[PDB]
Design a protein around this ligand. Structure first.
Ligand SMILES: CCCc1nc(C(C)(C)O)c(C(=O)O)n1Cc1ccc(-c2ccccc2-c2nnn[nH]2)cc1
Length: 376
């Protein structure tokens, strides 16, 4: 935990400022020495695709030798019983802290920084996120309990729809963190752990859902074109594995970063060959093309052929879900043209950046209205 180490140091360093005697100084200094060594083992935000033996990481750890070496000589004063002398030596860690934020914790400024910053986006988006949240909680909470009661896990279709309800709940728990994020004019108070798991949870919902809907399609194809409860459950737990592993880029590259040397802290992806677009497009093929073709060719048969009740809900979930992702896939494509440097105009950037939040709501609006399709 590298953020906690800096919190431990910055908190202890303030105990030195308000100190009285050498014992109180040493007690705080001895704890700061431990956190530097614990930090020196860690990997910083910007050095993700580099080895522990890289010259970048050798420089990371050398910075924390300069830290520990400075904490040594300050301790030497506190062992001798020199408080006012030691209090000065501890202020040398402020230049190390400053040096550190500049090198690893500042996101490289775009040409169009303010693009997307509009007041209505910071009131519209959170209140949308709030509605999607609480409706979706009571919505998908009702669906799981009626599956235990009424359906009682009778069908093979029933189990995939129970899983989809749970996958929607896992997503919804996190939303409050993005609601306020956007309400705070894009700044993230919740730290670096939650930056990752809350970003891994929305990628999850995309992979989980589409794999679950692929199974609902393949199920309804097999169930009434060529008329396995154990195998369905074996699939569902394997879907969670692949959706977790597909969301593993959210855990690796997401970090809380400052911007342009300011107070406000953003929870952004680090991109850093240009294979991040080359393999940033393999999510679209495996997300869209692999399921979409299988799911179209699944239903185009059984719709034309045709049991009926469960087909009506799955069709409505499937058609909406994919129609919802068209608006966003258009603008996230456009955003990749902006990131690459293909398109310059900041007025165009502004349009894409302001559109993005809205298109994201639409893509994840299904998590609260999927329960409404069960009603029917
Ligand atoms: C439902 C997501 C809510 C959300 N809204 C926003 C903004 C644009 C500020 O309004 C953000 C945001 O970019 O930080 N988020 C997090 C987020 C978005 C997409 C993804 C995502 C979705 C699919 C595939 C990959 C990712 C992803 N992972 N890491 N980075 N993007 C992950 C987290």
């Amino acid at each position: 935990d590298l953020e906690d180490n800096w919190e431990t140091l910055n908190d202890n360093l303030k105990v030195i400022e308000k100190a009285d005697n050498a014992a109180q100084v040493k007690d705080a200094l001895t704890k700061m020495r431990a956190a530097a060594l614990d930090a020196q083992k860690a990997t910083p935000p910007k050095l993700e695709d580099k080895s522990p033996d890289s010259p970048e990481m050798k420089d990371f750890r050398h910075g924390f030798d300069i830290l520990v070496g400075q904490i040594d000589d300050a301790l030497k004063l506190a062992n001798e019983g020199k408080v006012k002398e030691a209090q000065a030596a501890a202020e040398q860690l402020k230049t190390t802290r400053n040096a550190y934020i500049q090198k690893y914790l500042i996101l490289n400024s775009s040409d169009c920084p303010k693009a997307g910053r509009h007041n209505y986006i910071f009131v519209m988006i959170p209140t949308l996120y709030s509605i999607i949240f609480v409706v979706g909680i009571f919505g998908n909470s009702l669906v799981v309990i009626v599956i235990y009661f009424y359906m009682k896990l009778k069908t093979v279709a029933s189990v995939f729809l129970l899983n989809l309800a749970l996958a929607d709940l896992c997503f919804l728990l996190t939303l409050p963190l993005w609601a306020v994020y956007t309400a705070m004019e894009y700044r993230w108070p919740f730290g670096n752990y939650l930056c990752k798991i809350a970003s891994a949870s929305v990628s999850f919902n995309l992979y989980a859902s589409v794999f679950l809907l692929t199974c609902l399609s393949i199920d309804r194809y097999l169930a009434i074109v060529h008329p396995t409860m154990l195998v369905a459950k074996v699939t569902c737990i394997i879907i969670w594995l692949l959706a977790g592993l597909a969301s593993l880029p959210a855990i690796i590259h997401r970090n809380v970063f400052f911007i342009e040397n300011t107070n406000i802290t953003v929870c952004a992806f680090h991109y850093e060959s240009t294979l991040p677009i080359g393999l940033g497009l393999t999510k679209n093929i495996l997300g869209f093309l692999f399921p979409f073709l299988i799911i179209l060719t699944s239903y185009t048969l059984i719709w034309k052929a045709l049991n009926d009740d469960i087909f009506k809900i799955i069709m409505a979930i499937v058609l909406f879900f994919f129609f919802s992702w068209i608006p966003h896939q258009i603008f996230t494509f456009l955003d990749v043209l902006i990131q690459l440097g293909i398109i310059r105009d900041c007025r165009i950037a502004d349009i894409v950046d302001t559109a993005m939040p809205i298109t994201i709501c639409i893509a994840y609006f299904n998590n609260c209205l999927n329960p409404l399709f069960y009603g029917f």
